[PDB]
Amino acid sequence: IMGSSVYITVELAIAVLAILGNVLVCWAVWLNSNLQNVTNYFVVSLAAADIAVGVLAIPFAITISTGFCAACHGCLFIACFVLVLTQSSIFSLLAIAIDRYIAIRIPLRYNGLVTGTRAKGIIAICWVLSFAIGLTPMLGWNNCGQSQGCGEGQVACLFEDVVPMNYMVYFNFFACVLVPLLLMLGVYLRIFLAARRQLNIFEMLRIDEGLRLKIYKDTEGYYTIGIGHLLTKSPSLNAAKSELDKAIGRNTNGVITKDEAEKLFNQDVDAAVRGILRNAKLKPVYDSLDAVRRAALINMVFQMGETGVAGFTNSLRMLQQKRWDEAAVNLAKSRWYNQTPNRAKRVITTFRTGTWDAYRSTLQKEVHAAKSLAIIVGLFALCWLPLHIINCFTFFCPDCSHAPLWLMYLAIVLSHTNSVVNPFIYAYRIREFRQTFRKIIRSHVLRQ
Ligand SMILES: Cc1c(C#N)cccc1-c1cc(-c2ccn(Cc3cccc(C(C)(C)O)n3)c(=O)c2)nc(N)n1
Ligand SMILES: CC(C)CCC[C@@H](C)[C@H]1CC[C@H]2[C@@H]3CC=C4C[C@@H](O)CC[C@]4(C)[C@H]3CC[C@]12C
Ligand SMILES: CCCCCCCC/C=C/CCCCCCCC(=O)OC[C@H](O)CO
Ligand SMILES: CCCCCCCC/C=C/CCCCCCCC(=O)O
Ligand SMILES: CCCCCCCC/C=C/CCCCCCCC(=O)O
Ligand SMILES: CCCCCCCC/C=C\CCCCCCCC(=O)O
Ligand SMILES: CCCCCCCC/C=C\CCCCCCCC(=O)O
Ligand SMILES: CCCCCCCC/C=C\CCCCCCCC(=O)O
Ligand SMILES: CCCCCCCC/C=C\CCCCCCCC(=O)O
Ligand SMILES: CCCCCCCC/C=C\CCCCCCCC(=O)O
Ligand SMILES: CCCCCCCC/C=C\CCCCCCCC(=O)O
Ligand SMILES: CCCCCCCC/C=C\CCCCCCCC(=O)O
Ligand SMILES: CCCCCCCC/C=C\CCCCCCCC(=O)O
Ligand code: NA
Numbered sequence: 001i002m003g004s005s006v007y008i009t010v011e012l013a014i015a016v017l018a019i020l021g022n023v024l025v026c027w028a029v030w031l032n033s034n035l036q037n038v039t040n041y042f043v044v045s046l047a048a049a050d051i052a053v054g055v056l057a058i059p060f061a062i063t064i065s066t067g068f069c070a071a072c073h074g075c076l077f078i079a080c081f082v083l084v085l086t087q088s089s090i091f092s093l094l095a096i097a098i099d100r101y102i103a104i105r106i107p108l109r110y111n112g113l114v115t116g117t118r119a120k121g122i123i124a125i126c127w128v129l130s131f132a133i134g135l136t137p138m139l140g141w142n143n144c145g146q147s148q149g150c151g152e153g154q155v156a157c158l159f160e161d162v163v164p165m166n167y168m169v170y171f172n173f174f175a176c177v178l179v180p181l182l183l184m185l186g187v188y189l190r191i192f193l194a195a196r197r198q199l200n201i202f203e204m205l206r207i208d209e210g211l212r213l214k215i216y217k218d219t220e221g222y223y224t225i226g227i228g229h230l231l232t233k234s235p236s237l238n239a240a241k242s243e244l245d246k247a248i249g250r251n252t253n254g255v256i257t258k259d260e261a262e263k264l265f266n267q268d269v270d271a272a273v274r275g276i277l278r279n280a281k282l283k284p285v286y287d288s289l290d291a292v293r294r295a296a297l298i299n300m301v302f303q304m305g306e307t308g309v310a311g312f313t314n315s316l317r318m319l320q321q322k323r324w325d326e327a328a329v330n331l332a333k334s335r336w337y338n339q340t341p342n343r344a345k346r347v348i349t350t351f352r353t354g355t356w357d358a359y360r361s362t363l364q365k366e367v368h369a370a371k372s373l374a375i376i377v378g379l380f381a382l383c384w385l386p387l388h389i390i391n392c393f394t395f396f397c398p399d400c401s402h403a404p405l406w407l408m409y410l411a412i413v414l415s416h417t418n419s420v421v422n423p424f425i426y427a428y429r430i431r432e433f434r435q436t437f438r439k440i441i442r443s444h445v446l447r448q
Contacts, residue, residue, distance in 0.1 A: 007065075007409065011058050014416050018054035021423030022047040028436035035432055039099050039369075041119040043426075045127070046092035049085045050419035057082040058416055072144030075157035076137050082083035084134030086384065087176060091126035093377050094180050095119075097187040100373060103365045104194055108210050118439045133176055137163050173388045182382055188374045195367040199356035201295040202227070202262050203271060205302060208343045208360050213261060215240055215254040227252075228302065229268060272301045281310045285320045291317070296350035303343070304336060324352045372429035376422055383418035386411040394445045 008369040025047040029035045060078045070078070103110050144162045147155040155162060197203065215237060218224045223231045223240030229247075231240040237254065244252050246266075248260050254265075276282045276297070286297055295318075300309045309316075312334070318327040328348050331337060337344040347356035390403045390411060403411075426433035442448070 001448055002072045002312045004145070008062060010413060011416065014413070014420055015054035018050050018058075018419035021420055022050045023442060024437055025423050025433075027440055028433055031440065032432065035436065038114050038116055038119045039096060041093045041116065041123060042099065045123045046422065049088045049092070050422065052085050053082065053419040054150045054415065057085055061412065061416070064159060066156050067156045067377060069150035069154045071153065072142065072155050072162065073138060075144065075155060075162055076142055077135070079159045079163055080135050080137050083172065084130045087130035087133045088127055090180050091130060092175060093380060094184060095122060095126070096373050097184045097377065100370045101191055104191055104370070107366060111362050127166065136171070137167060141167055144273055165391065168391045173391065177384070177388065179433070181377070184377050188370065188377070191367055191370050195363045197363070199359055201230065204295055204356065204359050205265070206297060208299060208346065209217065209302070211258070211261060213256050213258065214242065225256060225264070227265045229264050237241045258354045269298060269422070270303070270445040272298050275306045276301060278340055279306050279310055281313070281316065282306060285316045288322075290354055292356065293351055293356045296347045300336070300349050304342075319351060328352045369430070372425060375429070376425055379421050379425070380418055383414050387415055428443045
């Protein structure tokens with residue numbers, strides 16, 4: 001058996017798995033409306049690039065491994081096409097990382113800013129940039145515009161013979177790969193730290209009532225800032241800014257920092273606590289509650305007012321009697337629960353447990369998808385970095401012994417393997433994908 005026959009068989013197997021797996025990804029998104037969100041628009045664009053790796057890039061790699069004689073511009077397309085697909089993968093991975101960041105940082109205003117029309121525009125632009133970046137050697141930055149044994153007008157189609165190494169290192173690796181990879185590392189780190197933020201009264205009502213650092217209108221149309229801090233009933237934003245500047249201590253033009261919103265919210269808590277202590281019905285309960293259960297009581301006061309909370313005579317006395325589970329059942333049978341069940345369920349869970357578990361869980365639900373997508377970037381890095389580092393050695397140590405043939409084969413094949421792994425990750429970590437996969441395979445493929 002020839003070593004070439006092993007290499008070709010391995011490449012063709014990777015090609016088939018790349019096409020089949022990533023066709024299944026696009027097929028699932030097209031079939032399942034629950035997978036038709038903006039995040040999976042970039043998943044499909046990423047899946048399309050990996051299909052093209054199996055149909056074209058891998059066959060292109062097998063042909064240029066022979067170093068055949070070809071015209072320079074035709075040889076450069078065969079060699080540089082995989083650079084287009086790899087660059088498109090980077091832009092899609094970059095878009096997925098950014099999309100998940102604003103999803104957890106502005107969870108309320110995510111849909112208004114992140115839309116399907118904008119995602120489709122970014123995808124079309126990124127595919128154009130990928131061709132411009134990948135096929136840059138075709139536009140003049142190549143080493144065949146100036147191989148003995150090929151005849152003039154042709155060159156031996158060898159990648160390192162035709163693709164300049166300073167392009168591969170400075171422009172492609174450092175600027176077009178390393179920088180987006182490090183930015184993706186910082187974005188996902190920022191996502192993971194936000195999910196691990198310490199919970200307190202400020203973060204509890206940030207989840208329940210939102211945080212806005214810019215002045216906005218509420219459900220009535222009253223100007224508001226921070227965590228539900230009313231500024232004025234006047235129909236003038238300038239009147240609201242005047243109230244904001246007085247409370248903050250500086251000219252704001254309607255924008256504040258997170259610490260300024262937290263300080264403004266700390267004063268609102270002190271006012272609500274002073275009102276609770278003045279109420280003869282609420283003070284004995286508040287005095288008996290622990291710090292976290294007091295935050296749930298302040299939560300209700302911020303939503304319904306001191307008088308509204310005082311109307312929970314039965315639930316309040318069971319809270320003061322430390323009968324947590326009984327108070328939960330009673331509070332769930334109230335109008336406040338029926339009107340806003342999600343916020344009420346989180347507040348009632350706080351009363352039962354005395355922990356922030358209901359608000360931590362809200363944070364983890366927003367980031368579990370991010371951990372699976374972050375694994376894909378790591379596998380992309382692990383699969384492509386060996387080639388980039390080899391290119392850096394050849395570039396910066398010219399008299400160094402070139403990497404042996406077996407490592408070159410392994411690094412090239414490993415890079416192609418990256419076009420197979422993503423559908424396996426979705427299947428193992430994302431249930432909506434795994435379930436759609438099973439339906440497609442059992443129904444459309446296996447017919448039963
Ligand atoms: C394309 C790329 C990207 C991207 N996107 C990122 C980093 C590096 C590279 C990259 C690729 C190649 C390179 C060379 C040759 N072949 C054909 C081939 C197949 C099997 C065996 C051989 C042997 C060993 C016989 O040469 N050749 C390739 O497929 C790929 N070379 C270099 N320096 N960098
Ligand atoms: C955040 C970190 C990882 C970025 C650092 C960039 C890395 C990938 C780059 C920057 C400097 C580079 C090194 C510069 C000089 C040398 C010595 C030479 O004889 C072999 C290549 C080698 C060893 C290079 C390998 C790749 C290298 C380490
Ligand atoms: C996700 C990471 C794990 C999955 C990916 C693991 C690495 C890729 C699999 C490789 C075997 C291919 C290595 C051998 C390369 C071709 C065979 C060969 O070298 O034969 C040619 C011979 O040297 C002269 O003709
Ligand atoms: C016509 C192509 C559609 C799929 C063909 C049938 C399966 C081919 C295998 C592709 C590897 C996909 C890896 C992840 C999918 C796992 C399947 C599953 O979740 O049950
Ligand atoms: C143009 C090349 C750089 C693009 C790479 C990825 C950056 C975009 C990331 C995707 C975020 C999800 C969609 C958000 C839409 C932005 C709203 C807008 O400003 O129009
Ligand atoms: C191997 C190259 C060609 C295969 C890749 C493209 C085929 C798979 C693409 C996505 C599958 C889901 C989208 C199909 C849309 C069908 C349109 C329609 O029937 O109205
Ligand atoms: C998934 C479909 C892809 C299969 C169709 C493309 C066929 C593969 C392309 C070339 C096959 C081998 C031809 C080159 C011989 C290389 C042997 C050598 O290096 O000496
Ligand atoms: C599934 C489809 C796979 C198609 C694989 C095509 C393989 C392409 C291999 C090289 C042929 C074109 C490169 C050389 C021709 C132009 C240069 C010249 O004419 O001298
Ligand atoms: C799904 C099928 C995809 C169709 C694309 C087929 C791939 C063709 C491969 C390379 C062709 C362009 C490279 C050389 C072009 C010049 C060749 C010539 O004119 O003699
Ligand atoms: C000779 C090289 C020829 C280069 C052709 C490629 C130039 C066109 C740029 C990208 C083609 C793929 C189109 C994908 C964008 C559509 C996706 C979308 O709109 O949703
Ligand atoms: C067309 C969309 C925008 C394109 C800008 C980014 C894509 C890359 C474009 C060309 C880069 C050219 C780099 C030139 C470096 C020196 C050239 C040389 O030494 O021969
Ligand atoms: C996705 C990010 C794209 C960023 C593109 C812009 C970055 C360009 C940075 C410099 C690359 C080229 C530096 C040296 C030029 C080569 C010198 C020469 O050969 O003429
Ligand atoms: C240095 C270039 C960039 C390197 C990869 C960047 C992407 C980093 C994203 C997250 C890594 C994987 C996250 C999965 C968490 C697994 C838990 C663990 O291993 O500690
Ligand atoms: Na890819």
